[PDB]
Design a protein around this nucleic acid. Structure first.
Ligand SMILES: [Ca+2]
Ligand SMILES: [Ca+2]
Ligand SMILES: [Ca+2]
Ligand SMILES: [Ca+2]
Lengths: 196, 202
DNA sequence: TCAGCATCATC
DNA sequence: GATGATGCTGA
């Protein structure tokens, strides 16, 4: 389906719905018949809207989720009406949708809530993925060296001055360790690195 | 399967933990996880969050920072949004942000439900061959200090490396295999253990 | 030999 | 998450 930027393609059955009317006062809706999903947010990303009556009716809604899931060129987002009436049927739907099919699931209480949430999704979809806030080792090396038995804040920097990487420190003989620490601590360090 | 539980969840999710223990064939280990609520596989963390805390936008920043810290350690993240014992723009924005970064979201009505979701996640992780398959403590503390390594990856290191020296001289591919981590993660660990320390850089 | 150093238990 | 009280380290 062709979805121009800043537009939502909606299934014709949504015409005159509160959902469509609330969206149409914020973003351009294009209506199209013969569509499996309820809305397309982009060419490849679509919405499958599961009503309170679908959820209470049984598992018939699953057939469509499977049909979209098995589409190579499409990513389905499931938006479900989770209300006082439907909520007992929600847990089995979430298991199937998210844990079985691996599809995104979003509950809403109402078409009014869905409208805000769908706009948020278009807004997310439209920005540069780099504006998604989710999309020097020396102080750490000191702390790592401090985990070696016998080695505190004073011996750690002395050890790293002479054996400058973990690998090199790991390979040091007792004789070489004895250039930096005493025999007891040289023995602790070496045992720490080499014991099974 | 095995799930690791952050010690701090004994305060906030006592019933999650007892519900987990009530599931036959689940090994439940509570551990000092440092922030992580649940570890459900070698590669996946779960953040349990109250819905009323997700709804308030003064928490939005702290929540984002906790997810950033989780991304530095784990390849996969799930958020479970749990109802406490009106829906906002901040909340919607959080949900979509999570979706854009591929963070999985689940919705729970109670602590008993959360446990059942955690169990289900570990079962699915298992079938993806990333199940936790491991049970000295000095060596664990050492591995745990490697930056951006998870508690499970550190435990894998303890259990699969016959000595600490053997681990420090491991190739990139050995770290990846024995620590059970992505190529990217094994590279970061390899670079750390090879990093040439220079004092004047402090 | 004796401060220096690491360590951890107790604020 | 900090002292600092306690006993090992070390040439
Ligand atoms: Ca037509
Ligand atoms: Ca130490
Ligand atoms: Ca010496
Ligand atoms: Ca939490």
């Amino acid at each position: 389906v062709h979805v121009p930027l800043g537009h939502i393609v909606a299934n014709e059955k949504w015409r005159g719905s509160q959902l469509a009317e609330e969206m149409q006062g914020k973003i351009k809706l294009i209506f199209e018949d013969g569509l499996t999903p309820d809305f397309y947010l982009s060419n490849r990303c679509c919405i499958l809207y599961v009503t309170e009556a679908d959820l209470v009716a049984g598992n018939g809604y699953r057939k469509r989720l499977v049909r979209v899931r098995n589409s190579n060129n499409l990513k389905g987002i499931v938006v479900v009406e989770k209300t006082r009436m439907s909520e007992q049927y929600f847990p089995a739907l979430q298991k199937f949708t998210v844990l079985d099919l691996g599809m995104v699931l979003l509950p809403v209480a109402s078409q009014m809530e869905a409208s805000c949430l769908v706009i948020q999704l278009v807004q997310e979809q439209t920005k540069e993925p780099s504006k998604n806030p989710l999309l020097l080792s020396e102080p750490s090396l000191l702390r790592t060296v401090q985990q070696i038995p016998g080695v505190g804040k004073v011996k750690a920097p002395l050890l790293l001055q002479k054996f400058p990487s973990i690998q090199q420190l790991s390979n040091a003989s007792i004789g070489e360790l004895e250039q930096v620490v005493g025999q007891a601590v040289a023995q602790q360090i070496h045992a720490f690195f080499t014991q099974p | 399967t095995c799930i690791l539980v952050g010690g701090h969840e004994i305060t906030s999710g006592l019933e999650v933990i007892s519900s987990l223990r009530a599931i036959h064939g689940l090994q439940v280990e509570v551990c000092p996880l440092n922030g992580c609520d649940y570890i459900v596989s070698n590669r996946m963390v779960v953040e349990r969050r109250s819905q009323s805390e997700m709804l308030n936008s003064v928490n939005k920043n702290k929540f984002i920072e906790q997810i950033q810290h989780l991304q530095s350690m784990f390849e996969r993240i799930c958020v479970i949004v749990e109802k406490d014992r009106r829906r906002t723009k901040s909340y919607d924005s959080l949900l979509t942000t999570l979706i854009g970064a591929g963070i999985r979201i689940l919705f729970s009505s109670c602590q008993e439900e959360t446990a059942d979701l955690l169990k289900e996640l570990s079962l699915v992780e298992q079938r993806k061959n990333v199940g936790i398959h491991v049970p000295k403590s000095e060596a664990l503390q050492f591995y745990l200090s490697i930056p951006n390594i998870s508690y499970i990856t550190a435990l894998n290191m303890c259990h699969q490396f016959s000595s600490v020296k053997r681990m420090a001289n491991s190739s990139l591919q050995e770290i990846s295999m024995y620590a059970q981590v992505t190529h990217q993660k094994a590279e970061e660990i390899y670079r750390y253990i090879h990093y040439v320390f220079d004092i004047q850089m402090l």
